[PDB]
Write an enzyme that holds these catalytic residues in place. Structure first.
Site, PDB file in Angstrom:
ATOM      1  N   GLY A  22      -1.043  -6.988   0.959  1.00  0.00           N
ATOM      2  CA  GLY A  22      -2.091  -6.542   1.875  1.00  0.00           C
ATOM      3  C   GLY A  22      -3.488  -6.856   1.372  1.00  0.00           C
ATOM      4  O   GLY A  22      -3.631  -7.435   0.301  1.00  0.00           O
ATOM      5  N   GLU A  23      -4.543  -6.481   2.124  1.00  0.00           N
ATOM      6  CA  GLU A  23      -5.921  -6.688   1.655  1.00  0.00           C
ATOM      7  C   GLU A  23      -6.327  -5.625   0.622  1.00  0.00           C
ATOM      8  O   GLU A  23      -5.905  -4.472   0.726  1.00  0.00           O
ATOM      9  CB  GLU A  23      -6.924  -6.696   2.817  1.00  0.00           C
ATOM     10  CG  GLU A  23      -6.786  -7.882   3.756  1.00  0.00           C
ATOM     11  CD  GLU A  23      -7.032  -9.253   3.151  1.00  0.00           C
ATOM     12  OE1 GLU A  23      -8.204  -9.575   2.844  1.00  0.00           O
ATOM     13  OE2 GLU A  23      -6.047 -10.009   2.994  1.00  0.00           O
ATOM     14  N   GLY A  24      -7.126  -6.048  -0.369  1.00  0.00           N
ATOM     15  CA  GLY A  24      -7.800  -5.181  -1.336  1.00  0.00           C
ATOM     16  C   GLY A  24      -9.238  -4.952  -0.897  1.00  0.00           C
ATOM     17  O   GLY A  24      -9.476  -4.807   0.305  1.00  0.00           O
ATOM     18  N   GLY A  27     -10.649  -9.205  -2.119  1.00  0.00           N
ATOM     19  CA  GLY A  27      -9.627 -10.243  -1.995  1.00  0.00           C
ATOM     20  C   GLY A  27      -8.275  -9.660  -1.644  1.00  0.00           C
ATOM     21  O   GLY A  27      -8.141  -8.445  -1.513  1.00  0.00           O
ATOM     22  N   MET A  28      -7.267 -10.510  -1.498  1.00  0.00           N
ATOM     23  CA  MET A  28      -5.921 -10.065  -1.140  1.00  0.00           C
ATOM     24  C   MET A  28      -5.095  -9.600  -2.365  1.00  0.00           C
ATOM     25  O   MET A  28      -5.411  -9.903  -3.516  1.00  0.00           O
ATOM     26  CB  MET A  28      -5.148 -11.137  -0.321  1.00  0.00           C
ATOM     27  CG  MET A  28      -4.931 -12.440  -1.025  1.00  0.00           C
ATOM     28  SD  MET A  28      -3.801 -13.511  -0.103  1.00  0.00           S
ATOM     29  CE  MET A  28      -4.780 -13.834   1.352  1.00  0.00           C
ATOM     30  N   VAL A  29      -4.042  -8.860  -2.073  1.00  0.00           N
ATOM     31  CA  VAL A  29      -3.057  -8.396  -3.026  1.00  0.00           C
ATOM     32  C   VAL A  29      -1.744  -9.065  -2.694  1.00  0.00           C
ATOM     33  O   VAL A  29      -1.341  -9.087  -1.532  1.00  0.00           O
ATOM     34  CB  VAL A  29      -2.889  -6.861  -2.981  1.00  0.00           C
ATOM     35  CG1 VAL A  29      -1.976  -6.394  -4.103  1.00  0.00           C
ATOM     36  CG2 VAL A  29      -4.242  -6.154  -3.046  1.00  0.00           C
ATOM     37  N   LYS A  44      -4.146  -8.556  -7.624  1.00  0.00           N
ATOM     38  CA  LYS A  44      -5.241  -8.521  -6.672  1.00  0.00           C
ATOM     39  C   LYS A  44      -6.297  -9.537  -7.072  1.00  0.00           C
ATOM     40  O   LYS A  44      -6.641  -9.617  -8.247  1.00  0.00           O
ATOM     41  CB  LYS A  44      -5.838  -7.118  -6.502  1.00  0.00           C
ATOM     42  CG  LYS A  44      -6.532  -6.480  -7.660  1.00  0.00           C
ATOM     43  CD  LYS A  44      -7.171  -5.153  -7.177  1.00  0.00           C
ATOM     44  CE  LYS A  44      -7.439  -4.191  -8.298  1.00  0.00           C
ATOM     45  NZ  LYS A  44      -8.491  -3.208  -7.909  1.00  0.00           N
ATOM     46  N   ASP A 139     -13.049   8.719  -4.604  1.00  0.00           N
ATOM     47  CA  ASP A 139     -12.457   8.181  -3.386  1.00  0.00           C
ATOM     48  C   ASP A 139     -10.963   8.393  -3.303  1.00  0.00           C
ATOM     49  O   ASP A 139     -10.178   7.491  -2.942  1.00  0.00           O
ATOM     50  CB  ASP A 139     -12.793   6.707  -3.195  1.00  0.00           C
ATOM     51  CG  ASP A 139     -12.703   6.224  -1.759  1.00  0.00           C
ATOM     52  OD1 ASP A 139     -12.741   7.083  -0.818  1.00  0.00           O
ATOM     53  OD2 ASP A 139     -12.604   5.013  -1.567  1.00  0.00           O
TER      54      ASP A 139
HETATM   55  C1  LIG Z   1      -5.585   1.121  -5.122  1.00  0.00           C
HETATM   56  C2  LIG Z   1      -4.576   0.118  -4.637  1.00  0.00           C
HETATM   57  S1  LIG Z   1      -5.264  -1.517  -4.507  1.00  0.00           S
HETATM   58  O1  LIG Z   1      -6.050  -1.579  -3.308  1.00  0.00           O
HETATM   59  O2  LIG Z   1      -5.867  -1.809  -5.767  1.00  0.00           O
HETATM   60  N1  LIG Z   1      -4.037  -2.563  -4.335  1.00  0.00           N
HETATM   61  C3  LIG Z   1      -2.869  -2.488  -5.131  1.00  0.00           C
HETATM   62  C4  LIG Z   1      -3.044  -2.461  -6.511  1.00  0.00           C
HETATM   63  C5  LIG Z   1      -1.958  -2.387  -7.349  1.00  0.00           C
HETATM   64  C6  LIG Z   1      -0.679  -2.341  -6.799  1.00  0.00           C
HETATM   65  N2  LIG Z   1       0.536  -2.270  -7.378  1.00  0.00           N
HETATM   66  N3  LIG Z   1       1.500  -2.249  -6.430  1.00  0.00           N
HETATM   67  C7  LIG Z   1       0.858  -2.309  -5.266  1.00  0.00           C
HETATM   68  C8  LIG Z   1      -0.478  -2.366  -5.441  1.00  0.00           C
HETATM   69  C9  LIG Z   1      -1.593  -2.443  -4.588  1.00  0.00           C
END
Ligand SMILES: *CCS(=O)(=O)Nc1ccc2[nH]ncc2c1
Length: 339
Positions: A22-24, A27-29, A44, A139
């Site tokens: 998904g989106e971070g 940038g993307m994850v 990410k 947050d």
């Molecule tokens: C706070 C979650 S994020 O937006 O940094 N994205 C993310 C980070 C690390 C992860 N490990 N498994 C899934 C994810 C998502």
């Protein structure tokens, strides 16, 4: 360079077989296979170097996450970037792969009281460590609580975090704030910069309420509408709580409102455990001076099956322009470089 949905996601030969998660923020994850440790990981991509605020939040998070070590806080396993400042355009942060997050889970799954109890315990255990380092997350929300297939929980996203500063918390009425609306404590809209630990406890209270019903408790549509929702449930603040707000614009706004009765928690959450509702009430206290602290929340009867202060560690110590910030991000990530 390997590409995911059109853009470069260039994570060397170490990480292969990328899938979009998904989106971070910058940038993307993706998930990827780690060829050294033989597990899928999350990565990410961050592109912060054009902007002061983006550099700031990227740097803040990297410094915090590298200093912290806790089971309920996401770590940094690796950081990928180019070998020189001139060549460095993107930064990739590699973290443990987590199946889901609490936002996704709440959209799709009813939680048992036993899952609610365990998730809340782990949130507070992680928060004890963060606050013990004199840091505020600022947050906390369901999307920032990662969960794996066995329901281990890890707090993520330290890009809005700050060192606590209660002596500079006071501000005027309707002062703009950055953190996510539905999880903002009432005082943000009245007289607070969000520089005390009580800010995070309010957010946890909102998360607990959301775990109980699968719906956000205070779904405001805009800045002061958020205060409409909070007062709609808590009711009008008492004289004593009002007298704590010395700022006249904030005080007189509250005085201007018609009387609102408290909505009992057991009427909002008729299936909830009564101990969970006692703790919820204490976390969603209007007056931040009266609001329960993290160590008290962990000691609440609701969490008695898990409470163990000897197994709820604290931090070893308190935590303390764009070209300069790029250099700082470069120096901070140097330990992950070959040689
Ligand atoms: C706070 C979650 S994020 O937006 O940094 N994205 C993310 C980070 C690390 C992860 N490990 N498994 C899934 C994810 C998502």
């Amino acid at each position: 360079p390997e590409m995911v949905r059109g853009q470069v996601f260039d994570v060397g030969p170490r990480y292969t077989n990328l899938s979009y998660i998904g989106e971070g923020a910058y940038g993307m994850v993706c998930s990827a296979y780690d060829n050294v440790n033989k597990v899928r990981v999350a990565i990410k991509k961050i592109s912060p170097f054009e902007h002061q605020t983006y550099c700031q939040r990227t740097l803040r998070e990297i410094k915090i996450l590298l200093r912290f070590r806790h089971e309920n806080i996401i770590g940094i396993n690796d950081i990928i970037r180019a070998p020189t400042i001139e060549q460095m355009k993107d930064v990739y942060i590699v973290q443990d792969l987590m199946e889901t997050d609490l936002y996704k889970l709440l959209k799709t799954q009813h939680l048992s009281n036993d899952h609610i109890c365990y998730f809340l315990y782990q949130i507070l255990r992680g928060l004890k460590y963060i606050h013990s380092a004199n840091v505020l997350h600022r947050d906390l929300k369901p999307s920032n609580l990662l969960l794996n297939t066995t329901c281990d929980l890890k707090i993520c996203d330290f890009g809005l975090a700050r060192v606590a500063d209660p002596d500079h918390d006071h501000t005027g009425f309707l002062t703009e704030y950055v953190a996510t609306r539905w999880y903002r404590a009432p005082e943000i809209m009245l007289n607070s910069k969000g520089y005390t630990k009580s800010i995070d406890i309010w957010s946890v209270g909102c998360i607990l309420a959301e775990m109980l019903s699968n719906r956000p408790i205070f779904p405001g549509k805009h800045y002061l509408d958020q205060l409409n929702h909070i007062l709609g449930i808590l009711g009008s603040p008492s004289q004593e709580d009002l007298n704590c707000i010395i700022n006249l614009k904030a005080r007189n706004y509250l005085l201007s409102l018609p009387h609102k009765n408290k909505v009992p928690w057991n009427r909002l959450f008729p299936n909830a455990d009564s101990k969970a509702l006692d703790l919820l009430d204490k976390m969603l206290t209007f007056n931040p001076h009266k609001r329960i602290e993290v160590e008290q929340a962990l000691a609440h009867p609701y969490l008695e099956q898990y409470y163990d202060p000897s197994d709820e560690p604290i931090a070893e110590a308190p935590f303390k322009p764009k070209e300069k910030l790029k250099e700082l991000i470069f120096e901070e990530t140097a330990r992950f470089q070959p040689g």
